[PDB]
Amino acid sequence: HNCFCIQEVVSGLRQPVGALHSGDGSQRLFILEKEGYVKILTPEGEIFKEPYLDIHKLVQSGIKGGDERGLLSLAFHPNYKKNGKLYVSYTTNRWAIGPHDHILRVVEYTVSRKNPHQVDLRTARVFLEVAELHRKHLGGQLLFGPDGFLYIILGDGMITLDDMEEMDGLSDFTGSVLRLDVDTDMCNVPYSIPRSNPHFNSTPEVFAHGLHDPGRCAVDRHNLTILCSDSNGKNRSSARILQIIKGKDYESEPSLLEFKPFSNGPLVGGFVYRGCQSERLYGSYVFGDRNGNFLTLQQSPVTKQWQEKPLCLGTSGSCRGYFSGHILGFGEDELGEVYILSSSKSMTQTHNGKLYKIVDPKRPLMPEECRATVQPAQTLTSECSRLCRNGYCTPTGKCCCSPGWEGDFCRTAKCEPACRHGGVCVRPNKCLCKKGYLGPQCEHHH
Ligand SMILES: [Zn+2]
């Protein structure tokens, strides 16, 4: 037979959202939970008791179901092994600059210099705040293409022309793919915009628009290709594709080409398999729906049209043709193997979300070629991590100072009118005076 195969990896999770890897050599797997947790799965199969990221108080994670309001996406820096930088997109509640139900946030975190299995929450750097009016069509998928730019895939938000021209506390960002350069040396702006962006100068972060209700978009690293499903509310069910070509400066927007290859209604999303266990699946675009029907989008090299071809599941040994509940998201190994994350109203009430791995029974679990050696995660050691006083330290390694600090790593304090009579500037605008010199700058004696 030619079916694939699913295997239970982990259970007892709370509403899983997705899972990814650190890219750091430790084959850690970080799994997202909707209430606002990122847990670590060890390559040997242990869930660490302490979460990697516990941010549940900051995130307004909606109850309902169909309610989309939780933690949305995580992305690791291509040089996290050096700089230890995360990017999280989540939904939060105090905004007073316009109308909202909530605001979709994009924040940068950094691992604890002391614990490689936990980030310290004090490192939060808000990158983007996107005012949202509705509790659907949110999106928020984060990803790094090659050349190292960060992509954010924001949905419709169900944002309509009425509310756009009604109030101004509304964002330009919804329904768009945004591409950013996090590798800034600037300290005035949290992120730089690459010169190869369309609207790089225009009187900007928007790389493409048109998106409505996208699932998890498939990402081909090969130039980059991102391919999205889209629900469009109750209006068909289409695929939209973005390709960037090979090193080209944009001044007008690339087309977000639409086509309609789907038939089995709404889809959760897809992935590009670049794993190792399955030879045949290599380089395939896979999309699954809520109930676990899988497809393949394949492109004719001749008549560049897209075609869907069903994939079957089937049991072979304890690796089974089915899984429990409904698919909520997808996952990937550092080795590139792919997972589905499931739950149900029955297994939500009990905290029983599952991680399931997809398997090719036609191949061995460890083909000779797929052998890799685990490189256990280490504590940050980079220059900026150890020296940069307080105030954020950018992914490039440049150390940005908080008000009233100066120097390469912000070690020297600033005294606006300088200290006198041999005083020492200890904190910003604080002088440590020698005995018998009083006042804010030690300017007095008698
Ligand atoms: Zn106005």
Curated annotation (Swiss-Prot):
Record keyword Metal-binding present? yes
Which stretches make up the EGF-like domain?
Answer: 383-410, 411-443
Tell me which UniProt keywords the record has, alphabetically.
Answer: Cell membrane, Cytoplasm, Disulfide bond, EGF-like domain, Glycoprotein, Membrane, Metal-binding, Repeat, Secreted, Signal, Zinc
Glycosylation sites recorded in the entry for this protein:
201, 223, 235
Cystine links in this protein are 3-312, 5-319, 187-400, 217-228, 276-370, 384-393, 388-399, 401-410, 415-425, 419-431, 433-442
- Gene Ontology cellular component terms for the protein in this record: cell surface; ciliary membrane; cytoplasm; extracellular region; plasma membrane
According to its UniProt entry, the protein's GO biological process terms are:
dorsal/ventral pattern formation; epithelial tube branching involved in lung morphogenesis; negative regulation of signal transduction; negative regulation of smoothened signaling pathway; neuroblast proliferation; regulation of fibroblast growth factor receptor signaling pathway; signal transduction; skeletal system morphogenesis
Annotated membrane topology? Peripheral membrane protein
Keyword Ribosomal protein recorded: no
**What is the predominant subcellular site recorded for this chain?**
membrane
Localization: Cell membrane; Secreted
Tissue specificity here reads: Widely expressed in fetal and adult tissues. Highest expression in adult heart, liver and pancreas, and in fetal kidney.
Q: Which GO terms describe its molecular function?
A: hedgehog family protein binding; zinc ion binding
Q: Which portions of this protein are annotated as coiled-coil regions?
A: none
Region of interest: Interaction with SHH zinc binding site: 161-173
Binding annotation for Zn(2+):
168
Task: Please state which protein family the record places this protein in.
Answer: Belongs to the HHIP family.
Q: How does it assemble?
A: Interacts with all three hedgehog family members, SHH, IHH and DHH.
Quote the entry's note on domains.
A flexible loop interacts with the SHH zinc binding site and contributes to zinc binding.
**Biological role stated in the UniProt entry:** Modulates hedgehog signaling in several cell types including brain and lung through direct interaction with members of the hedgehog family.
Q: What is this protein called?
A: Hedgehog-interacting protein
Included stretch of the parent chain = 214 to 667 of 700
